[PDB]
Amino acid sequence: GTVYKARDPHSGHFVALKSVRVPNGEEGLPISTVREVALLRRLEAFEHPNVVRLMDVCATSEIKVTLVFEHVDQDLRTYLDKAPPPGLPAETIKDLMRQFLRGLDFLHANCIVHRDLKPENILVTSGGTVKLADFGLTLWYRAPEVLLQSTYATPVDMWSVGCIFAEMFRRKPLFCGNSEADQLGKIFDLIGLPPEDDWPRDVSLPRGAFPPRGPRPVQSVVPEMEESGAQLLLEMLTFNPHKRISAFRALQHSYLHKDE
């Protein structure tokens, strides 16, 4: 149905209503409905500051399930387009990245893969708090192993994080492709064509689908980024998903260590 929005007068915060119209059969509530809604209830208990809070589950009975969520008006794309002409200060970017990573690490520690991280579903409160939005329910941000249709787990989110990380400096996306084959070609243009024994098995396009190419210097695409942040960017933009940096590890990288 139609999505509604309202301000809370207990605070000044906003609230929204989503709602799914679930198929009621002879076995009652569908398996996927009770599991997925219960997972949101379990997350809510931790009260993590970098995910949107679930406020209520209002089911009415065919059966209809309505969720009341915390609503954040501004997403990151808007936050970035409002940035000063010179761009966002480095300290602001490191702060957004720390929160982004804590939120993602939280989902990953709960065996949730987001799978569709993009600036459109990363929200920023008027106070500067980052909140992850449409989890557990365009190809630019897609990890190579997903574009190849092979096995994927949580590393696919850290690839997306690298893209968004670089995008906060460029104020324009890193890899813009028309298809999976094209998106991959643009990726290998930067990080180089992976070697043979790094290619997944039973993959959609062989390695011969791509011309030989070596890595460009990664600060060629983010020249305004300090050298150690560029090292961290490379560890996110790593083809092998088993060598790609995890969210928790990225939080221990010196580039994201707040001073004092």
Binding site: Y4, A6, L17, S19, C58
Partner: protein
Amino acid sequence: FKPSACRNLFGPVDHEELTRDLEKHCRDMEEASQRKWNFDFQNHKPLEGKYEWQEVE
């Protein structure tokens, strides 16, 4: 036909009374939620109260 684990534990059920009760309980929770958010979840349209609902395209 009937495993030994198949057994009534605590006697007869009054089924019409049970059905009446089960829908009273459920409608009660629906009413309370509708009053909590002043939003008619059953028909998905807003009501008036603390929360001034608006659509977002």
